[PDB]
């Protein structure tokens, strides 16, 4: 390092490019082995070296890759750089604006420009990792926060997770202050970007700070955050109030997480460290005002919607946040389950979950590639934690209010989406409610029993519902009460209606659904035998279509061997005559073979139960077999 003055022959504009890369590597190596003992703080004429790199990054006659190596600098030249960062500001800014287009997704992977872009990103991230520089941190952030999910952000998130888990406590505290600043500064920027800051970087960062380091940030922000939370929702005559709402958003999304990861004795105890909602000079004995945030949370928590608002979705998601917050505070501070209800599921005729979800999302179900499929919808995981915790916290009233919202609002006063949401809660919360079943099957069944459940066909939704039911049956066994019968009949009818599917084994799985559906709780379950006959009456030689009825009758048979023409809108003779007439079709195996199998099982039923139709059915079977006999031996 000491003789380095001669290096001006290198870096040279007239120097060939390869030497430019090489000498930088020399620097990188030397900066590794030095541990920054000298030529970083006081010793040595820094201005020459620093100005050299200022120009070097500032160059225009260099490839992007010379910059790419050149951004290995930042791991150094960013420690104890009292002032002079602003040269770094201007040069870094001009670089990033020079070579990082905002809208990335018009360049396909494998594009050389895309490769340069990702390489520069990675190099910047390594610089961030080795540097922990707050200015580098913030620069990275505004790189990220321009739109959502546009630069393979899994690597940025991994990096940001990495930065927090290391470094001196004050270092993280400063990083936190930095990442906080650009959320709150009054500069009018895109509100979407504002949300994205705390979302994609800050929320994670706080999630992964070191222990004991959180109270620093909570202490740092708490009073101003709460003050902003006080009020000011009033002004709406300007769309820019969107900025205001987003400001509240992030504040929520950070306070809540702060309630998490913090021990109960540090958010509430006889000694109240966080006593700063008030002046705290006199209120040092006991914590009761940190709660006051939930008192604030109420008002947005139950906000009577406008009539013709303009920020609908934003309002909605905002309320969603405030709810998540409420869940956090309830699960952190209060202990009694009556206070787990403390305000969390108390509801006014102007009510809460009627707010939290949209009503216009068609919101379809799937059987698609690669639980989280549309549990991605907001608020879910907090509710899940809530229910699991309270179950480990031993409530029927709390489920009682939900099932009020479910079946007492089984009326269409609540749109279907809301029902599906409640259900999906029940779905993923199955284990928690394994006991409290008997008084729930009929509502949940009533859900799928609707002629409207999502769209059409066996939704993954109805698969879930029926799975819940069946799984419940072995203990709850809810079979045979006046609503149970009519619902279940609707269910069997609907299921057996659509068992067919284009897909190879999805059909099989639906058939297995039917199988377990009947067999697990076969009582008072009329089997729609008319439906069956249409499902196998397909006088069509080269068709599939008779097979589905074949197999379906096969289920109704194999379960328990029940009677097979109780005034089913068809008469026995032609009923079975068509059934046997099936085995005429030799053109597909699953048609005739399965036909024979089902017929044989039918014979067994009729024999050991000694009915009278066995004679006629035997004669018919015999006749059609013979009509094969002399004709086509193989079949």
């Amino acid at each position: 390092l000491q003789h380095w003055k001669k290096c001006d022959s290198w870096w040279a504009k007239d120097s060939p490019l390869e030497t430019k890369m090489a000498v930088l590597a020399l620097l990188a190596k030397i900066l590794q082995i030095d541990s920054s003992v000298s030529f970083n703080t006081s010793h040595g004429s820094f201005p020459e070296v620093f100005t050299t790199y200022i120009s070097l990054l500032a160059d225009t006659k260099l490839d992007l890759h010379l910059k790419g190596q050149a951004v290995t600098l930042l791991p150094f030249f960013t420690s104890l750089t009292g002032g002079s960062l602003e040269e770094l500001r201007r040069v870094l800014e001009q670089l990033i604006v020079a070579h990082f287009p905002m809208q990335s997704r018009e360049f396909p992977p494998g594009t050389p420009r895309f490769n340069n872009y990702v390489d520069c990103m990675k190099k910047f991230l390594d610089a961030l990792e080795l540097s922990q520089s707050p200015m580098l941190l913030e620069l990275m952030t505004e790189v990220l926060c321009r739109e959502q999910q546009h630069v393979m952000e899994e690597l940025f998130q991994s990096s940001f997770r990495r930065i927090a888990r290391r470094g001196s406590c004050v270092t993280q505290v400063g990083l936190l202050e930095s990442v906080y600043e650009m959320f709150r500064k009054d500069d009018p920027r895109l509100s979407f970007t504002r949300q994205s800051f705390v979302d994609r970087s800050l929320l994670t960062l706080l999630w992964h700070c070191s222990l004991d380091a959180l109270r620093e940030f909570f202490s740092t922000i708490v009073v101003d955050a709460i003050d902003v939370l006080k009020s000011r929702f009033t002004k709406l005559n300007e769309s820019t109030f969107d900025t205001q709402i987003t400001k509240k958003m992030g504040y929520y999304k950070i306070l809540d997480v702060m309630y998490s990861r913090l021990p109960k004795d540090d958010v509430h105890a006889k000694e109240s460290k966080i006593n700063q909602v008030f002046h705290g000079s006199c209120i040092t004995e006991g914590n009761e005002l940190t709660k006051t945030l939930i008192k604030l949370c109420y008002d947005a928590f139950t906000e009577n919607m406008a009539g013709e608002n303009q920020l609908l979705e934003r309002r909605r998601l905002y309320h969603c946040a405030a709810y998540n917050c409420a869940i956090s505070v309830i699960c952190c501070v209060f202990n009694e389950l009556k206070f787990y209800q403390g305000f969390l599921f108390s509801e006014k005729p102007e009510k809460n979950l009627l707010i939290f979800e949209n009503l216009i999302d068609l919101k379809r179900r799937y059987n698609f590639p690669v639980m989280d499929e549309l549990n991605r919808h907001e608020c879910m995981a907090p509710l899940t934690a809530l229910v699991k915790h309270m179950h480990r916290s031993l409530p029927r009233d709390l489920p009682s209010w939900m099932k009020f919202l479910h079946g007492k609002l089984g009326n269409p006063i609540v749109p279907l989406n809301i029902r599906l949401f409640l259900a999906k809660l029940v779905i993923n919360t199955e284990e928690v409610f394994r006991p409290y079943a008997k008084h729930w099957l009929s509502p949940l069944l009533q859900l799928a029993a609707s002629e409207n459940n999502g769209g059409e066909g066996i939704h993954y939704m109805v698969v879930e519902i029926v799975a819940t039911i069946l799984s419940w049956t072995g203990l709850a066994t809810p079979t045979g009460v006046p609503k149970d019968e009519v619902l279940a009949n609707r269910l069997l009818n609907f299921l057996m209606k659509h068992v067919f599917h284009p897909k190879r084994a999805v059909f099989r799985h639906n058939l297995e659904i039917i199988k377990t559906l009947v067999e697990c709780w076969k009582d008072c379950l009329s089997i729609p035998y008319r439906l069956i006959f249409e499902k196998f009456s397909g006088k069509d030689p080269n068709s599939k279509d008779n097979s589905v009825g074949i197999q379906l009758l096969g289920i109704v048979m194999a379960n328990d061997l029940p009677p097979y023409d109780p005034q089913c809108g068809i008469q026995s003779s032609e009923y079975f005559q068509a059934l046997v007439n099936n085995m005429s079709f030799v053109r597909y195996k699953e048609v005739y073979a399965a036909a024979a199998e089902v017929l044989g099982l039918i014979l067994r039923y009729v024999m050991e139960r000694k009915n009278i139709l066995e004679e006629s059915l035997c004669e018919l079977v015999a006749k059609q077999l013979k009509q094969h006999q002399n004709t086509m031996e193989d079949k």
Partner: peptide
């Protein structure tokens, strides 16, 4: 209603 939050 503040009683529930208070207690």
């Amino acid at each position: 209603v503040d009683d529930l939050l208070d207690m």
